[model samples]
Target: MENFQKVEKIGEGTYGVVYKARNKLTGEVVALKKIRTEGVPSTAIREISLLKELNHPNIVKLLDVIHTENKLYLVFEFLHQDLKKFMDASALTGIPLPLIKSYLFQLLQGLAFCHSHRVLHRDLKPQNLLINTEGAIKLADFGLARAFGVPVRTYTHEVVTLWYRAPEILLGCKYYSTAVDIWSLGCIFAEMVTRRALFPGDSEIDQLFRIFRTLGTPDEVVWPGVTSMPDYKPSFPKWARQDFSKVVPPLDEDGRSLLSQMLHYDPNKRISAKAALAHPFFQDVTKPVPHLRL
Candidate 1:
C-alpha cells in the first residue's frame, strides 16, 4: 500500500476519491479509491465484502485492499473509459446493429451473473458501467450495492437513480427483488438504441408518472398494495395503454419484444436476468466470448 505511487486524480465518486496510481515494483496502472475510514465503517465493510465475493469479467476486478492510518484504499483494474464518456463521444451512433447488440448482450450477461449471486447492484446507470478499448462493458460501483432477499428488513427506498428506478420503488415499495435491476436494464437498452435517455424526470413523482404514461399505471389487480405506499398518488387523467411501436421504433420485432418484457409495469412479472439472456433478441447475437483486455 505504501509503495504504490499516486500518479493523478481520476474522478470523484459517491463514497470516495479515486486516483490513477502505479505499483512501484510492477509498474502497473491501477485505480486507487481512497475511502474515508472515519465515521464510515459500514460503507467500508459493505464495499470490501461485496467486492471480495464478486469476480466476473464484466465486473471490475478488486485487486488489493490497503489500509493506511486514516483511510482505506481499494485497488481496482484501471479502465480506460466509461459508458458516459463513450456515449458523449458519439461512439454508439454509427455502430452497426450487430455491434450494438453485442454491447447490450455483454451488459445483460454481467447483470445476470450479479443476480445469480444474489447481489443487487441498486445503481445501474451508464456512468457505473465501464468499457475498455475492446468495446466490452463492466459494471462498477459496489458502494451502493447490497445483498437482498432476507425475511423482512427495513430498507431505504432511496437506492436507485431517479431515472432508472422501477415503479415499485417509486411507489415506496420496500420489499422488492432483483426485478428493480431489470427495470434499469430496460432504461439502458432504450438509451443505447436512441443515443439518449428515455425518461429524464427531475423528480421521483414525475418520473413515476412518465413511466406510467408510457407503460400504463399498475393498479391493485396488477400490483397489489400499490395504492397503500406512503408516496402513492394518482396520476392526472387515467392510465393509457402501452404503445411499443412509438416507444422503440428502431428496434426489430425481437428486440422490441425483449424490451417490453424488461419494462413490464408489474415488477413481479419482469423478465428474469437469466431468461433475458436467452430472449429471442439475443438468439443470433454475438456473445462476449473474447475476454475483455485490461
Candidate 2:
C-alpha cells in the first residue's frame, strides 16, 4: 500500500488510533483507523467483515482497507464529530427541544436500519453516533457487534458499553435479541431529554436496582423466566411500580408514553426499531432522513 498523508489523530478507538488523512492521489479526506492485528484476529475480522456486508445510509461507509507489515488499516469517510461531542459542546441542557428531538429521531432511524438487516449494534451510546456537517447521524463502531438470528446459539452477555447495557444482559440472559439495542436506545433517549445519564450505576446489580427504583423490578409476571437466568437476583428496597414522569421530567406526554413502550422490562414487549421509527415522536420531525449517507 502506498503512503497516504496522515493528517491528525481524530480519536482513540477500541482497537486503533483513528486519524483524519488525505489520499495523495484523490486528495480526499478520510478517516484512517489503524488496527493492531498482532493477536486480535477476531476483533479485526468482526469489524471488517461486518462493515462489508451491512451497507446503509445510517451506517458508516468503508472506503478502503490497507495492510502493511503486520498492521491493518481501515479507511472510512471522515465524519466531523460524534453525538457525544455535539451534546457536550452544545451544553445538552441548553440545546433547543426541537434539536434534541431531531437527534433522537435520527438515532432511531439508524437503529431501525440495522435491526431490519438482523444486525445488533450491541453498542448504541452517544459516542458511537457520528455526525456530519448536515447534522446527520450515522452509527459507527462495529467492534463488538454481531449478526444474530441463528437458532439455539449462545452469546456472551458481556457485550455493550457499561452505561448502555440492558437489564437482560445484567441478569445474565445470553439468548437475547435486538431488544437489547432497544434498551440502550431508551437509555440514550432519557439522557437526551435530561441532559445527563439517567442511571449512572457502577455495577450490574446497582444498574438493575437503579432501573427498578424508577421503573419497578420485573418478576415472572412482567418478565417471565427472568428469575431463571444464571445471574438473576433480587435488588435492595425492591419496588412494585414505575414513575415515568419522575424519571423523565422534561419529556412531553407523548415522548414519555413512547419511551415507556421502548423501555419495557420484558424483552418480548419492547418496541421494535421499525415500530419506534413509526412512533409519533417523529411525527413533526422536518426533512428527516431515515437512512445514512455513505
Candidate 3:
C-alpha cells in the first residue's frame, strides 16, 4: 500500500473497498482492492484465480496481488467509470443505438471468453461493468463467479444481484449454467436502452413478479420443469407475456429479438454469449469506435 499513493476511495466493491491509486515509482494509475475481512475470503481467492487466467480486451486486467496473514490487496487497471454511473449521467435522455450496441457487443465478447473457459460470471450488473474514456466496457467484479464443467454440477442458488438474477436462480435452481449471465445481459441491454432498471423490484418475489408481468409467468409449456423448481408454487399469480417492443419501445426489432433470446425463461434456451455476438442487432456496429462521446 505504501508503494502506491492512494488518490481517493473509489467505491465499496462486492468483496472489498477499492481505491484509486497511482504508483509511486511509475505514476501509473490503478485500482487497489483491499480485503476487509480478518481471514482471506473465498470470494477474493476465487476472483483472483479466474481473473489471473482470463485475458481479453473486454476484461479488466489484474496487474498484481499482495497479501499477508489476514489482509489481501488486488491491483487492477483503473477505468474512468462504471456502467451504472455512466448510464445514470445520461438517463434523462438515454444513450443512442450505436453506443448501446458497442457496449453490449463488448460485454458479450468478454462473457464469451469467460464461458469458453467454463467460467460463469454469476454476477453481471451495470456496476460490475467498468468503462474508460475510450468507450471500452471491461467486465469486472468476479467475486461471485465460478467455474463449471460438462454435466454441470449443482451450485448455490444464492448469487447475483436480485435485479439481474436469472429466473432459474430466483426459483432456487441449483443446476444453472452460463445462461444466468445471459439473463443479466438481457436486463443490462434493456437498461442501456431505457436508462433505468427494467425490473425495479424491492425483493426477490417482487423481482420475479416484475419479470413475469413483463415476460409472462413461466409454465411447463414455455419452461419445461419450471413447476418442479424448489421455489415454484402452483398457486403463484399468472401474468401474460407482454410484447418486448412495447415494454422497451426504444429498442429496434432485431435488438428486441436478441433480448428475447437472452431473457428466455428456459435457461437452456437462452442465447449464448458467443452466439449473441453475431446477432443481427449488431449489424451496423462494424466500426471500431475510438471513444464513447460523453
In model 1, which residue pairs have backbone atoms overlapping below 3 Å?
Answer: none
Residue range with the least summed lDDT across 10 consecutive positions in model 2: 148-157
Best by lDDT: 3
Which model, 1 or 3, shows the larger TM-score?
A: 3
Model 1, range 1-294, lDDT digits (tens) per residue? 677999998766444668899999788999887753144465556657666767888888888776666567788898877776766676445445676688788878887887787767766788788887666778886434452112121222123357898888777777778898889988988887777787888887779878878877777877677777767776444677677878876788898889988988777789988898898788888744322333
Model 3 regions lying over 4 Å from their true place: 36-38, 41-47, 143-160, 287-294
Is 1 or 2 the stronger prediction by TM-score? Answer: 1
Off by over 4 Å in 2: 36-47, 147-160, 234-237, 288-294
- Estimate, for each residue in 1-294, the C-alpha lDDT of model 2 and write its tens digit: 376889888776454577889999998999887753144455556556666666777778778766566667888888877777776775634556676677777777777877776767776788788887665778776433442221221232223356888888788877778898888888988887777887788877778788888788778888888878788765446687767888888788888988898899899999988888788888887643322233
Model 1 alpha-carbon drift over 4 Å, by segment: 36-39, 42-47, 91-94, 147-160, 234-237, 287-294
Which of the two, 2 or 3, has more lDDT? Answer: 3
Clashes of each: 0, 2, 0
User: Residues 1-294, candidate 3, lDDT per residue (tens digit)?
Assistant: 788889998876445578899989878999987754147666657657666766789988878777766677888888878888878887777777888889899899988988887777787889879987766889885533442112221232223368999999989998889898899989999988987799888888999999999999999999999999999999889999999888888778999999999999998899999999888888888434433454
List TM-scores for all candidates, in order. 0.85, 0.84, 0.89
